[PDB]
């Protein structure tokens, strides 16, 4: 058979009959509007189908067109600067064809445009009779001024070259290569196709040794991440999960950004489309818009619930395809809790037995096999390159409770945990990262990086974690006993922890001087705060035995200008001021405070 | 004595649902029988019969059910239950969770085929374990001492360093001196970094020729985890009870094993136990954990160290709760100690060893071992009770005696528990570091110690 028929409908779930040859996870097209869905259970001649478009108005006896293929993605030039839905339909070309503000149900548009011509250069050394294997780069497309798009042989393809296209301008439908293996010819264009539920192969996976830079002072100093890392960002509503994800997407050392927004607001995808074209990085003394290196996948909170799963697998498959060119890719998932919630409705309508909080028993395996697609790699194929994917997943625990099954499964997987606190967000303390619960597993991998590039830093990081942990032990006593019993070194510890908490760990992401913080500004700020601590502690500890002695109250009255200058270090602007001017000012604060402690 | 009869092949699939394929028209179906499935593209998968009723059979598929269809996919019934090949040549090899090679070596040329479920050893034929393993770790060798043939899990949680504890025990373990281990290592659902860490440490320790690895990673199929521990333990029983080796067996996340059992039990629509886990999970875990010890007249042994991650750090969760009712104690790894950068993060209060009472003492270790162990435990328990009071009332309310317990508690964590990843303390070094801490108190406070032990060991 090539068609089954709709037997019954209940929400996003359809049962079809005459489906006898259909396999598990085939795509089908349901109804007279031909809505895409995927086969999720078999029983006799019947199939159960999960539909990616709204089923309202579908009738019993409607056709179910059986397609011999799983859910897959088109991979080729035209991905950078685009926005797609969760099943890879292009939202700008939908707007152009329909001339309307809506996505029609069952609409088809080709994922990559077949009308645009691309400049193709073949790889010089390839000739007729060359032996070639999957992942081999055979030409390059000048996709835009920021991204060169490498054209490479599909995984599971191989043979001897029988044709290779000359330098020229070509459609995504034009043949650029021919090759044969068993005496049967294959012909290839600039677009390949890959199943999204399958991992794209690599030669080897590698230890992650190089940082992913977020531009936050917390995160980059206290809780680092790596190229090839996995991260989770749990928090209550309004903590900053989106603002961290957008800031890391704007300002970081990654070559390509993939942004997935599944189950989240439409106004936030509109925000990125407004903001990112106006915002430029600088290359060869020339500016380039960050939208030239970016792709978006959308499936907003009011779009079809089953398409949230399609968004996640689409996004990581697009990310693996650019990793395979030898790029460092970051993938953002704007809430993984919204995919887990989609698994729960389909599991409910399939009438399955649940695990914790109604979620399906397979939820932990879904999350764990998604995050395993991150890493640093030697690519397939023979130009001998390396690349990576880093994954950052937001988590939206209901009621803010981190005992949430999705959070609790996720923290069993990820190597970095940035736990957000609603009590910091309500103070307008941002990023709202709780420094007591948050952690990174990568701090030993980065030893050799800091021991080369920032040789002063690891001692400062260590002292800062100790001051913050000492203040947390003092604060419980202070709350009950009323502060008066404290030693002068404890009053110093509380005040310097307050200085760090208020003026180091805090950034406004929407103001020019703290949009992005360089690691030179970050190490310089922490060095001066820790220097003042060591001097203030030395002055008290040295004099406290004498008849006339220093106290923190004496230091306050003597050094109010230095304390005000230390709180003001944050306001220096990395692009209005120079690196040289910022470092010279922070050196002048060190002389100013040394001359004040000499005067004690 | 061979199955010389031809295998029946069926194209009679009648349903596919989660990890399960259902067949009908099967001839005399056999419970626990192995099945081989061929998908329409020529891919092969393997599975086991979970239930039979008339001509109907239910198969769990080890490599999953994607791409299976009810018309072209065909199943060959093998006539037998799951028997793995075994040999001594399995030492110095790397396999997946199905026992297939991943080292680019050949498949196992069998010395025998063994049922992965084992055979019940008669309680009359077991030997009680009394040889102490010196692990090199003071929190273990001092206070939770391990006998050769015991089962004692590491109870841990997400973000904690339990892999470093297990690897340090593999490096440092041996007998007390006044023989060396074969290692069988099972990974269920580990990340690639964990698999690299252990494998790299066996290569760098130079001992990789005396270890067998079975690896299932977090991207490998979940249903192979059902058989992975059983392949590891069937290999250990051949080495221990036929080749007379001493085997240390590591099962590195029993929480991922228990999660795979919940996937199958939920798919079969069975009556749930606690937290959705199978109602038979105690009996299932017991058939893994009780495959250890010593037997009458054979010069070999199996010691098990399972590892657990406790979800939300809760020891009352079914996975750690059932495990404590089967194993001879636990080693508890604590986020409170880890957040303070103490390593090993072992909390001695919830930790236990149920076989140390007979593995220590005169001629076994030293005569003071039990007395030091009890008195250090009692002081640390009292020190935590003092610390919990002090956090309310402030230091001016404490007696001199309370400050002795509070000093002992700080000194005990800095000197006894803290150790570092390559330091290998003997029992005797451990016990003397113990006396250097008991020296914080006058003899009148050392009430768990008899006067002969005080008189002989306190004044040194």
């Amino acid at each position: 058979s090539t068609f089954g028929y709709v037997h019954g409908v209940s929400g996003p779930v359809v049962t079809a009959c005459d489906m006898a040859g259909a396999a598990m996870y085939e795509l089908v097209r349901v109804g007279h509007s031909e809505l895409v869905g995927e086969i999720i259970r078999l029983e006799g001649d019947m199939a159960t189908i999960q539909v990616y478009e709204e089923t309202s108005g579908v009738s019993v006896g409607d056709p179910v067109l059986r397609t011999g293929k799983p859910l897959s993605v088109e991979l080729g030039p035209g991905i950078m600067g685009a926005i797609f839905d969760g099943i890879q339909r292009p939202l700008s070309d939908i707007s152009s064809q329909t001339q309307s503000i809506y996505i029609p149900r069952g609409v088809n548009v080709s994922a990559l445009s077949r009308d645009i011509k691309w400049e193709f250069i073949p790889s010089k050394n390839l000739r007729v009779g060359s032996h070639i294997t999957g992942g081999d780069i055979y030409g390059i497309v000048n996709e835009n001024s920021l991204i060169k798009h490498k054209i490479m042989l599909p995984p599971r393809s191989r043979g001897s070259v029988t044709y290779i296209a000359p330098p020229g301008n070509y459609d995504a439908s034009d043949v650029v290569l021919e090759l044969e293996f068993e005496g049967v010819k294959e012909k290839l264009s600039m677009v390949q196709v890959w199943p999204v539920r399958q991992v794209r192969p690599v030669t080897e996976k590698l230890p992650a040794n190089h940082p992913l830079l977020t531009g936050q002072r917390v995160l980059d100093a206290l809780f680092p991440c790596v190229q090839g890392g996995t991260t989770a960002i749990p928090g209550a509503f309004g903590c900053g999960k989106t603002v961290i994800s957008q800031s890391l997407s704007k300002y970081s050392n990654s070559d390509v950004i993939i942004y997935v927004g599944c189950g989240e607001r439409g106004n936030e995808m509109s925000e990125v489309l407004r903001d990112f074209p106006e915002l430029t990085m600088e290359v060869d003394g020339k500016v380039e818009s960050i939208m030239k290196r970016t792709a978006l996948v959308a499936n907003t909170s009011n779009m079809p619930v089953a398409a949230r799963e399609a968004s996640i697998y689409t996004g990581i498959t697009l990310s693996e395809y650019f990793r395979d060119m030898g790029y460092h890719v970051s993938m953002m998932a704007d809430s993984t809790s919204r995919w887990a919630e989609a698994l729960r409705e389909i599991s409910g309508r399939l009438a399955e037995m649940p695990a914790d909080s109604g979620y399906p028993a397979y939820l932990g395996a879904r999350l764990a096999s998604f995050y395993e697609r991150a890493g640093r790699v030697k690519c397939l194929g023979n130009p001998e390159r390396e690349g990576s994917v880093s994954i950052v997943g937001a988590v939206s625990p209901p009621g803010g409770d981190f005992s949430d099954p999705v959070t609790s499964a996720t923290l069993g997987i990820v190597q970095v945990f940035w736990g957000l606190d609603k009590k910091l967000a309500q103070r307008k303390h941002f990023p709202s990262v709780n420094w007591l619960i948050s952690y990174s597993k990568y701090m030993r991998a980065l030893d050799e990086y800091y021991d080369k590039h920032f040789t002063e830093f690891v001692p400062l990081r260590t002292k800062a974690k100790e001051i913050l942990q000492e203040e947390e032990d003092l604060a419980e006593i202070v709350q009950l006993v009323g502060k008066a019993s404290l030693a002068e070194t404890d009053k110093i510890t509380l005040e310097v922890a307050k200085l760090i908490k208020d003026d180091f760990l805090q950034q406004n992401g929407y103001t020019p001087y703290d949009r992005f913080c360089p690691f030179y500004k970050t190490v310089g700020m922490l060095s001066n705060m820790i220097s003042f601590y060591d001097m203030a502690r030395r002055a008290v500890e040295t004099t406290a035995q004498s008849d006339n002695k220093i106290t923190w109250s004496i230091i306050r009255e003597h050094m109010g200008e230095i304390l005000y200058k230390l709180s003001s270090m944050k306001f220096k602007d990395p692009v209005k001021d120079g690196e040289a001017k910022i470092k010279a000012d922070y050196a002048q604060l060190l002389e100013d405070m040394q001359n004040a402690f000499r005067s004690l | 004595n061979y199955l010389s009869q031809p295998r029946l092949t069926y194209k009679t699939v009648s349903g596919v649902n989660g990890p399960l394929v259902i067949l009908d028209h099967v001839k005399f179906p056999r419970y626990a029988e192995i099945v081989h499935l061929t998908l329409p593209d020529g891919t092969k998968r393997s599975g086991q019969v979970l239930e039979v009723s008339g001509s109907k059979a239910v198969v769990q598929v080890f490599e999953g059910t994607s791409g299976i269809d009810a018309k072209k996919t065909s199943c060959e019934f093998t006539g037998d239950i799951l028997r793995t090949p075994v040999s001594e040549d399995m030492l110095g090899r790397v396999f997946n969770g199905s026992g297939k090679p991943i080292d680019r070596g050949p498949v196992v040329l069998a010395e025998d085929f063994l049922d992965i479920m084992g055979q019940p050893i008669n309680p009359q034929c077991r030997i009680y374990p009394e040889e102490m393993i010196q692990t090199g770790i003071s929190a273990i060798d001092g206070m939770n001492s391990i006998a050769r043939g015991q089962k004692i899990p590491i109870f841990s949680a997400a973000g904690l360093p339990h892999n470093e504890i297990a690897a340090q025990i593999c490096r440092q373990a041996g007998l007390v001196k006044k023989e060396n281990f074969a290692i069988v290592f099972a990974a269920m659902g580990v990340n690639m970094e964990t698999a690299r860490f252990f494998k790299s440490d066996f290569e760098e320790n130079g001992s990789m020729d005396n270890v067998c690895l079975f690896l299932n990673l977090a991207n490998d199929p979940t249903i192979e985890r059902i058989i992975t521990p059983r392949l590891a333990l069937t290999t250990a029983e051949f080495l221990a009870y036929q080749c007379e080796k001493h085997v240390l067996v590591i099962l590195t996340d029993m929480s991922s094993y228990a999660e795979a059992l919940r996937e199958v039990s939920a798919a079969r629509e069975e009556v749930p136990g606690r937290r959705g886990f199978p109602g038979y999970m105690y009996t299932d875990l017991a058939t893994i954990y009780e495959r250890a010890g010593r037997v009458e007249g054979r010069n070999g042994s199996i010691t098990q160290i399972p590892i657990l991650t406790m979800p939300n750090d809760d020891i009352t969760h079914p996975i750690p709760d059932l495990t404590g009712y089967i194993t001879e104690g636990q080693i508890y790894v604590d986020r409170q100690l880890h957040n303070r950068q103490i390593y090993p993060p072992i909390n001695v209060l919830p930790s236990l060893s149920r076989l140390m009472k007979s593995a220590i003492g005169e001629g076994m270790t030293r005569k003071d071992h039990a007395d030091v162990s009890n008195q250090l435990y009692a002081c640390y328990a009292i020190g935590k009770d003092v610390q919990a009071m002090k956090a309310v009332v402030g230091e001016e309310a404490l007696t001199s005696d309370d400050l002795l317990y509070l000093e002992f508690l700080q000194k005990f964590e800095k000197n006894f528990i803290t150790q570092g990843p390559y330091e290998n303390r003997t029992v005797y070094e451990t016990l003397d570091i113990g006396w250097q801490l008991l020296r914080i108190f006058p003899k009148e406070m050392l009430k768990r110690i008899p006067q002969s032990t005080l008189s002989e060991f306190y004044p040194r």
Binding site: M353, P354 | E269
Partner: peptide, 25 residues
Amino acid sequence: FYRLKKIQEKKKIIKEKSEKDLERR
């Protein structure tokens, strides 16, 4: 409670299928 219901339904379905089979026999 939600897991102890659904078991009741699946048992009721098994009884009804068995009764239909006894009507077929």
